[model samples]
Target: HMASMKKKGSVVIVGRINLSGDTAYAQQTRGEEGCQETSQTGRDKNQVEGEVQIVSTATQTFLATSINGVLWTVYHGAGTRTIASPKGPVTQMYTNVDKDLVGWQAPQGSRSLTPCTCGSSDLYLVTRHADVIPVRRRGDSRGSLLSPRPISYLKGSSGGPLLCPAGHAVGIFRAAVSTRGVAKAVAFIPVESLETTM
Candidate 1:
């Protein structure tokens, strides 16, 4: 058996928006060919969906891109599906003033804040696909207000939760910070920021 094959995660899915007026307006902005429903399947308009990793069962929420939060509001009345190892519609959502992070109240459950200054390399990420992949923090060049902090090897981990060694979730995966297309470090939304928004 491969020891590296097993690890840690649940997910939430949002349906596509079908506002033809907005769609037409969006299409017009892109100019003709580029505007007409870009899809891998065909030329036909395809539904675009969004998914985020559930971070807390108690709060029934997940962390994701702030952009998604705004979209979720725009489609507040829209439906959502939760997919867990077992798994609703979103109850609430929050976005930090910086607009770089989003806290989506979907489903799941947590402990407390293991301050970044006190945490160790024993940290890991609970990804959307349920992979408990270990990751390394980029060091103290950043902090709470300066977060989502930079970490490494989080290419496809947006919306995942960052867990500290003591079992507290310190942050949520946001994006891969890159320099001229090369990913240097990954960014995450600190739980503290979410606290303020809440």
Candidate 2:
């Protein structure tokens, strides 16, 4: 029950960001203050947006593919705490807040996820308003890939998290490929690449 509960609450709408002039959604963790702080602090009570805390400029194979998915950061309070499944290479405490946001649980004894290996996994992409869209894993050779690209209802979900059946985040939703204006596949930056950014 705890894992399921974490799945529901872990992915919060980090709000809108228009770095490249085109508005996109960045899904991450909320600080202790939650949405209340955003609604009251600013003069525009309706405007709630996330600040860019960290940007991954790595020139890796997957990094380049994720053109719009490299940015991650703290929002609201950005507080730190220990988690049961410490995502960092070492230490239980989340010194870097990125892992806390995506809710990735590192395997014990230094084990990490290998892309294109999760067979028959019940994957879902969690986005704003707690919208969990079912996704099918295709492959990850170029970048972590998913199938049945998001439709209109799933718009602005570019920067959400891809959760495995176990409720652990394995990647960050990035780009989408379409044919004749019909969405075909979606790309995600795998957790392996996320380590460098964190």
Candidate 3:
């Protein structure tokens, strides 16, 4: 059966800023490019590493991340009882299939934040040697991207993900102040928003 043909896996987060001094690089993936799967798991790649991507599986799917080991990547939920039974009670389930440390689908109830973006120089691509390694990040609550920063007026990272020294995600890329360096020196949204998404 096609289902039997599929394999399982994991994608851990080892973000650049998280390494001893930062290791991985961040790249935004497109619809094309690495539509390729892995040699081991057979599951498709998310195209990037630093940021979280919506994931899927057998008869179901949802937002997930490799940052915390085989997690379902959800904000809030409730139910009766069951396993990965599409008809089960838990929204987030444990799966030995379609598992990759690097994956997370967008949630519904969460709000979005901006970012000043990932720092450090030793950054590398998320998809190395044909698979996502693993990764996470952190940040401030005030100020823009800092001088030479800002938007045409309202500054921000504008879609950039602010990384933490531990690799855990902190801020999300958003619009920076368009004032000078403009664009908030690459503003990032709040990672908490992602944490609260239902």
Candidate 4:
């Protein structure tokens, strides 16, 4: 599908910031007003499957969320990010750092929170269907340190919800902090910043 565009040199896949106005990101996904992108044609936003790799024309990538069937990602790229699928090419919803970005895909019911003493040696990074992967926190240095401290997280791990205290999710796993800590070292994003971006 990208054949034509790749020839004309227009749309590209890959990878938002808190945006203003109708939030340029909103147009392509309201359903009918969307456009052709990188050989990608639009489909029902909910039609997307599994994890779609975010393509960006932006200077650097910011963040992306597909928790709600739509991928709201952060990139400096022009237009919007696109996702190809068996149904067709799908456009992602865009947002910025001013936003928590995405997390509409929460579980069916609300579970309580205890907070606990935070977590100890064995932290469980929970997945959507409930995959409890083991955790080994990074050694602390200072700055009151970190609650989750900082760990070198996996790529697919980003934006996955961070569950804590054998309770509900504390926050969305977004990025890391302290330079290497924010991305490579590691960090998380609160759901509060998400809906506020719009």
Q: In terms of lDDT, which candidate is strongest?
A: 2
Q: How well does model 2 score by local distance difference test? A: 0.38
Query: What TM-score does candidate 4 reach?
Result: 0.38
Question: Scored by CA lDDT, what does every candidate get?
Answer: 0.38, 0.38, 0.29, 0.34
Ordered from best to worst TM-score, the candidate numbers read: 1, 2, 4, 3
Name the runs in model 3 displaced over 4 angstroms.
1-142, 146-158, 184-187
lDDT of 1 by residue, 1-198 (tens): 797773211223322211223221111112223222221112222223232222222213333322312221111111132222111123345434353543444332211233344556455655434445565766432222122333443343455556676546566666566666655555666655554556
Q: Candidate 3 on 1-198: residue-level lDDT in tens? A: 776784332221111122222343333232221222221233332223323433222222223333322223322110111212112112234321221112133222222323224553221112221122112222332223323422333211122234444444454333333543543333233454444442
User: What does the lDDT read for residue 115 in candidate 4?
Assistant: 28
Backbone Cα, N, C clashes tallied per candidate: 14, 0, 84, 23
lDDT of 1 at 27: 13
TM-score of 1: 0.41
Task: Name the runs in model 4 displaced over 4 angstroms.
Answer: 1-79, 97-156, 164-170, 177-185
Candidate 3 Cα lDDT to native: 0.29
Q: How far in Å is the alpha carbon of 39 misplaced in model 3?
A: 22
Q: What tens digits encode model 2's per-residue C-alpha lDDT throughout 1-198?
A: 767653111222223332223443443433335433332232112222232211111110111111122333222122221112122121222234443333222322222223333444457665543445677777751232244443554455544556667645566666567666556666766656565555
| Superposed Cα deviation of residue 118, candidate 1 (Å) | 4.7
TM-score of each: 0.41, 0.40, 0.32, 0.38
Determine which window of 10 residues in candidate 1 has minimal summed lDDT.
Answer: 22-31
After superposition of all CA atoms, the RMSD between model 4 and the true structure is 12.3
